[PDB]
Amino acid sequence: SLLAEFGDPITRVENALQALREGRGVLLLDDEDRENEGDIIYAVESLTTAQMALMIRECSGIVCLCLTEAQADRLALPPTVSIEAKHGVTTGVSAQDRVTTIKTAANPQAKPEDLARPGHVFPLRARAGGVLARRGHTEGTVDLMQMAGLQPAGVLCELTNPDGSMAKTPEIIEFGKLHNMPVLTIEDMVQYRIQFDLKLA
Amino acid sequence: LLAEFGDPITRVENALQALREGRGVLLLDDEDRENEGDIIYAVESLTTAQMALMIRECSGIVCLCLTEAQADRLALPPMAFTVSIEAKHGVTTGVSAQDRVTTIKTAANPQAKPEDLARPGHVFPLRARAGGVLARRGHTEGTVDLMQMAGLQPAGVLCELTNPDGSMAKTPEIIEFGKLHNMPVLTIEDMVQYRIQFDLKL
């Protein structure tokens, strides 16, 4: 298979988790199909301006903040939503300001009044159960953070070739090599969680 | 260094002519050095390559600026939440430069119907106030006004220019970008003064 050289599914997940623990990004696909498009995922815990700058210049720019249901509830988000930190920003759209918004929104101590709407960051609620309930990249992002033992919030954005076409699996693989970002799939994550999160007795 | 693009009337005329030629322009509020600027393209001549440049160089949150009439034709919410749209047909995942252009052309089509568009999506439509920059000095109004003043389909796309390091391009960097890309730079104040002088009944 197209990703087989990079480890079996569980190894790909393990490698992705270790990259996140080290503060590095990963690349997420639905599965190994050649025509899949993919996302850069960063942990919010270790998110830097330079990472956000990379994400914006390499991706769609429509940067999504993936949150638990509990964290979105803490923000009084509705059950397109967009947000901006009330404080600590200027015009909201710079890489630094988006990181500020993201850190503010993902803070477990956050209150709704910490944010203004609308803004340049797009929050998304992960389903309870994660990829075992819904195979979305929103669930994938939050599950990865939880599986890595990190703050359960991550940012995602769609990798875009410079000519404006979306990066497909082959291009995502090459981007992963260039930027040393492990590539994994939602299918890999499901296989991992079925193996390690389920009761066996 | 804004005067390197001419006097304020020349700045408007050069911007209109660039748009007539299918080229982009850069828009600021006024001459203040701390202003942040946007790339503007006419929808009438919008290409995949121009949208690709926007996504590469700008915030990526590409806005489609429409007349009230066109936004009503699409049954967009009247002027808390963000409105976003996607072409119903002729796209795949919606987010590629080509797909966004398809969405934009679909939405700005003078014969459009509401069901031509799905919601949500990856293009962000904005209603320009009636009267344009003479009613509201927003970049949304600036965009639609420029198209109308240039005699074009009254729809344009807008996106905030970034610097390579993720910071936003302010006036000095906007000027340099304009030089490099042969894109006229102008301000909303230029446009207001121009329309006062030329767009009023005597």
Instruction: Establish, for the pair of chains A and B, how many residue pairs have beta carbons separated by less than 8 Å.
Output: 96
- Which residue type is seen at A121? V
Integer distance in angstroms from the first to the last C-alpha of chain A? Answer: 33
Tell me, yes or no, if B97 comes closer than 8 A to chain A by beta carbon.
yes
* CB atoms inside a 10 Å sphere around CB B141: 23
Q: Could A56 and B165 be called an inter-chain contact, meaning their C-beta atoms sit closer than 8 Å?
A: no
Q: Which residue of A has its CA nearest to B83?
A: A80
* DSSP of A50-91: HHHHHHHHHB-S--EEEE-HHHHHHTT------EEESSS-SS
Residue B36 CB partners (closer than 8 Å, separation 6+)? A91, A93, B28, B160, B161, B168, B169, B170, B174
Whether B18 contacts B24, CB under 8 Å: yes
Q: Could you give the CA distance from residue B124 to residue B84 in angstroms, rounded to a whole number? A: 5
Distances in whole angstroms, Cα of residue A119 to Cα of each of A72, A116, A137, A194, B80: 16, 7, 22, 37, 10
- Cα atoms found within 13 Å of the Cα of residue A94, Cβ hemisphere only: 20
Q: Which residue of B has its CA nearest to A36?
A: B93
What CATH number did the domain enclosing B16 receive? 3.90.870.10
Distances in whole angstroms, Cα of residue A152 to Cα of each of A18, A46, A82, A130: 15, 12, 19, 11
Breaks (C-N over 2.5 A) in chain A follow: 79
Of A61, A81, A118, the CB nearest to B60: A61
Residue B171 CB partners (closer than 8 Å, separation 6+)? B2, B28, B31, B32, B33, B34, B35, B37
Distances in whole angstroms, Cα of residue A124 to Cα of each of A49, A56, A67, A99, A156: 21, 18, 6, 16, 10
DSSP annotation of B169: P
* 3-state secondary structure at position B166: coil
Please return the burial class of B34, using the count of CB atoms within 10 Å of its CB with bins 0-12, 13-18 and 19+: exposed
Q: Could you give the CA distance from residue B141 to residue B154 in angstroms, rounded to a whole number? A: 11
DSSP annotation of B80: -
Q: Could you give the CA distance from residue A137 to residue A63 in angstroms, rounded to a whole number? A: 13
| The two three-digit tokens of residue A190, written as one number | 């499901």
In SS3 terms, A126-152 reads as CCCCHHHCCCCHHHHHHHHHHHHCCCC
CB contacts, 8 Å: A82 with chain B? 81-82
- Which residue type is seen at B16? L
| The two three-digit tokens of residue B53, written as one number | 């440049």
CB contacts, 8 Å: A64 with chain B? none
Q: Could you give the CA distance from residue A173 to residue A111 in angstroms, rounded to a whole number? A: 39
Q: Could you give the CA distance from residue A177 to residue A106 in angstroms, rounded to a whole number? A: 29
Q: Could A80 and B120 be called an inter-chain contact, meaning their C-beta atoms sit closer than 8 Å?
A: yes
Question: A19 CA to chain B: closest CA distance, Å?
Answer: 23
- Cα atoms found within 13 Å of the Cα of residue B38, Cβ hemisphere only: 26
Domain that holds residue A89: 1-201
Q: Which resolution, in Å, applies to this structure?
A: 1.6
| The two three-digit tokens of residue B117, written as one number | 């568009």
Q: Could you give the CA distance from residue B40 to residue B32 in angstroms, rounded to a whole number? A: 19
* 3-state secondary structure at position B61: coil
Helix axes A186-196, A137-148, angle to 10 degrees: 50
- Helix, strand, coil percent content, chain B, rounded in steps of 5: 40, 20, 40
* 3-state secondary structure at position B95: coil
- Number of domains, chain B: 1
Q: Could you give the CA distance from residue B24 to residue A167 in angstroms, rounded to a whole number? A: 26
* 3-state secondary structure at position B35: coil
| The two three-digit tokens of residue A84, written as one number | 């901006």
